[PDB]
Amino acid sequence: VLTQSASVSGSLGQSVTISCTGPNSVCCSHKSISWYQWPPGRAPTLIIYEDNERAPGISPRFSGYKSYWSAYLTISDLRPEDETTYYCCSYTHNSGCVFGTGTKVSV
Amino acid sequence: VFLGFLGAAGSTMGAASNTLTMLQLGVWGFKQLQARVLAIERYLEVQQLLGMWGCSGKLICCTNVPWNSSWSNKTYNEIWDNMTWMQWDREIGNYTDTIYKLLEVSQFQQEINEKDLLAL
Amino acid sequence: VFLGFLGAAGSTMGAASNTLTMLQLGVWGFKQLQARVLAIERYLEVQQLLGMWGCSGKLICCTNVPWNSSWSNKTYNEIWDNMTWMQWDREIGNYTDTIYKLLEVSQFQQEINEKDLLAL
Amino acid sequence: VFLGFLGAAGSTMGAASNTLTMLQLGVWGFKQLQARVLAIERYLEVQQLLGMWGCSGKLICCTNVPWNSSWSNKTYNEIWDNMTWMQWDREIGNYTDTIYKLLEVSQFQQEINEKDLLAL
Amino acid sequence: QGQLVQSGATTTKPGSSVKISCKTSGYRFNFYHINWIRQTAGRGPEWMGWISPYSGDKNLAPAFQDRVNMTTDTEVPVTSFTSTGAAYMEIRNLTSDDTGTYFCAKGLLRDGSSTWLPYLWGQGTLLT
Numbered sequence A: 001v002l003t004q005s006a007s008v009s010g011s012l013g014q015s016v017t018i019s020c021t022g023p024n025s026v027c028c029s030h031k032s033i034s035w036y037q038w039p040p041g042r043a044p045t046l047i048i049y050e051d052n053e054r055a056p057g058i059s060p061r062f063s064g065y066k067s068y069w070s071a072y073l074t075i076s077d078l079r080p081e082d083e084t085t086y087y088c089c090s091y092t093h094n095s096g097c098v099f100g101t102g103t104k105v106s107v
Numbered sequence B, C, D: 001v002f003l004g005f006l007g008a009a010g011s012t013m014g015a016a017s018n019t020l021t022m023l024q025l026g027v028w029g030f031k032q033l034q035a036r037v038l039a040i041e042r043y044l045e046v047q048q049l050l051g052m053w054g055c056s057g058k059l060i061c062c063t064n065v066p067w068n069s070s071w072s073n074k075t076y077n078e079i080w081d082n083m084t085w086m087q088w089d090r091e092i093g094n095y096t097d098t099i100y101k102l103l104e105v106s107q108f109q110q111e112i113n114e115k116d117l118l119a120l
Numbered sequence E: 001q002g003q004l005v006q007s008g009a010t011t012t013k014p015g016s017s018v019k020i021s022c023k024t025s026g027y028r029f030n031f032y033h034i035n036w037i038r039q040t041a042g043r044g045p046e047w048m049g050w051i052s053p054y055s056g057d058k059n060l061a062p063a064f065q066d067r068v069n070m071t072t073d074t075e076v077p078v079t080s081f082t083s084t085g086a087a088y089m090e091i092r093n094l095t096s097d098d099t100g101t102y103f104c105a106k107g108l109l110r111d112g113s114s115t116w117l118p119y120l121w122g123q124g125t126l127l128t
C-alpha cells in the first residue's frame, strides 16, 4: 500500500530524492519512516531510521526528510556503488515494517 | 548501607540512570577496622571530585564542557538506548582523566564569574 | 569540635530549631584511634543522607513530600510550640525510614526534571 | 591526591586565587593506616566548616558579613595586588575564629529566611 | 559486530513445512529481537515477524498469523557481552507462492522507538 518513486537516476556529483507516500493508514505523521539499501537477493543495509537518523558507520551524505504526507531519501554526491534499489519502512514503536513498492537508481 | 545500586547493570544506560523503576585487637578486630576505613577513604575519593565540579549533593549535574567528538562520535540514541553503563565506561575509559581536569577548570572559572556577578 | 548543640534539649521545637538565641599502640593508642574513626563514620552516615535528599550544606531544607497525616495528625501550633525535639522524635520514630526512602525518590526525580529543563 | 596546590605560594593573593594560569600490622602497617586516618579527619575538619557557612562545593563563596575595618583597614589594591596568602593569613590570624562564628550565624539565619520565603 | 549465519538452501514442494535456522555470534543474543523477512520474487519484500530472545514474546504479520512457527533456544554465554543463540522459523500450509530468499536480522537497539528494527542481516536462504 506504500508507494514510492517509479525510478530515478543521476550522475557522479549531483543528488537524487526518492519519494515514499501512502494513505493515512500507512502515512505518515503518526509513523516512523526508515530507509533500506537492498541489492536484490542479497543482504540489505540500514541507512536511515525514524525519519532522519543515520545508522552507525553511514556516510553523512545520506539524508532523510518527512513532511506530514510523505518521506524522502536524499542521496547527495552519488558514487558507483549507490546503484541499487531502495525501499522505505513504516512502523511505530510496537509493530512491524510495512515496506514500499520499490525505487531503483543508477549513475 | 545501600551502596549496592548495581540492580540495573545489564540494562540500557537510559533505562537505568534516567528513569528508575567495640573490637578486640585480633584478626577480626583489625580486619573489621581496616574494612571500615577502606570504605570511607573511597566515599571521599568521589565526593571530593563531586565537590570540585560543582556537583555536591547532585546525582545528575549538568556541566559547561562541550562533548569532544573524538571521545565518542556516537548518537544519544545509540548510547542511552543501546549501551550499558558497564561497557560504555570501558569504551570511554581512556579519556576519563582529561574530562576530570577539564570539569575542574570549568567549575573554578564559574566560581569567579559569579564572584564578578555578585560584586555588583 | 562543637557537635554538642544539645543546649536546647528541653525547649520547644520551634524555640530551638527556628530561632536560636602520634600514638603508641597501647590501650590508649588503639582506644583513641577507634574513637577517632567511630566519629567520622557517623558524620558521613548523615551527610550522605543529606546529600541524597538535596540537602548538602543545609540545616533547614524544604522538600517536595506532602505530610501524610497518618504519621502525625497534629497541628503546627501543637508541635513547634508544645513538643520538644526529644519527644517528637519518639512519637514519629516508627515511620522514620519510610520518609527517608520517599525523600530519596523526590530528589532523584527532581534531579532529572532539571535535567529535562536544562536540555532546552 | 593533588591536595598540593601551593604552586602559587609566593604570588600575590589576586594572582593566585582569582585567576589561575592490605597491611601487615607492623611499623609500616600501623604507620600507613594512621597516616590514612589523619588525612581524612582534616579534610572533614574544613568541609564541615564549609557546610556550616553555606559553601559546600564552592571554592569562592560570597557571604553576608560586612568587613569590620578593625580586622584590616587595608585596600583591595594593597591586598590582592600586594600581599600573598601566606602573610595575609598571619596578619589576620587573630580574628580568624570571630569571623567563623559570625559566618555560622549568617548562614543559619539565611536558612530560616528561605524557610519563611518558601512557606508562601 | 555480530554475524547471523542462516541455514542451508534446501528446496521442498507444496504441502510441506521447512525450518530455517539462524545462528548468531559476536553479540548478546538476548538483547535484540530476531527478525525474519521474506523477499518473494512475485511480490514486495514482506515482513514476517520478530520474537524476543529474552521475553519470549512474538509478533507476526496477519498474513502469517496462523501459518508460521518461530522459536529460539537459549543462548550460550561466551564472554560478558558475547553469546551464541539460534533462531528457528517454520511455515504451515506451505505452497509454491512462498518461494524466495528468506532473511534473518537482529534488532536495531534495545530501547526507544526503533527497538526491533532489522539492523544486522543474515546471509539469506534460497527456497523454491
Ligand SMILES: *[C@@H]1O[C@H](CO)[C@@H](O[C@@H]2O[C@H](CO)[C@@H](O[C@@H]3O[C@H](CO[C@H]4O[C@H](CO)[C@@H](O)[C@H](O[C@H]5O[C@H](CO)[C@@H](O)[C@H](O)[C@@H]5O)[C@@H]4O)[C@@H](O)[C@H](O[C@H]4O[C@H](CO)[C@@H](O)[C@H](O)[C@@H]4O)[C@@H]3O)[C@H](O)[C@H]2NC(C)=O)[C@H](O)[C@H]1NC(C)=O
Binding pocket: A093, A094, B008, B010, B011, B012, B015, E030, E031, E032, E033, E052, E053, E054, E055, E056, E057, E058, E059, E109, E110, E111, E112, E113, E115
Ligand atoms: C533486559 O534486557 C532485555 C533485552 O534488551 C530488555 O527487554 C527489552 O526492553 C525494552 C525496553 O527497555 C523493550 O522495548 C519496548 O518494547 C515494547 C514492545 O513490547 C510491547 O509490545 C508487545 C507486542 O505488542 C506486547 O506483547 C508487550 O506487552 C506485554 O508483553 C511482554 C511479554 O509478552 C512484556 O515484556 C511487556 O512488558 C508487556 O507486559 C509490550 O507492550 C514497546 O512497546 C516499547 O515501546 C514503548 O516504550 C519505549 C520506551 O521503552 C518508548 O520509547 C516507546 O515510544 C513506547 O512508548 C519498547 O520499545 C524491548 O522490546 C525488550 N525486548 C528486547 C529488546 O528483546 C529488558 O527490559 C531488560 N531488563 C532489565 C531489567 O535490564
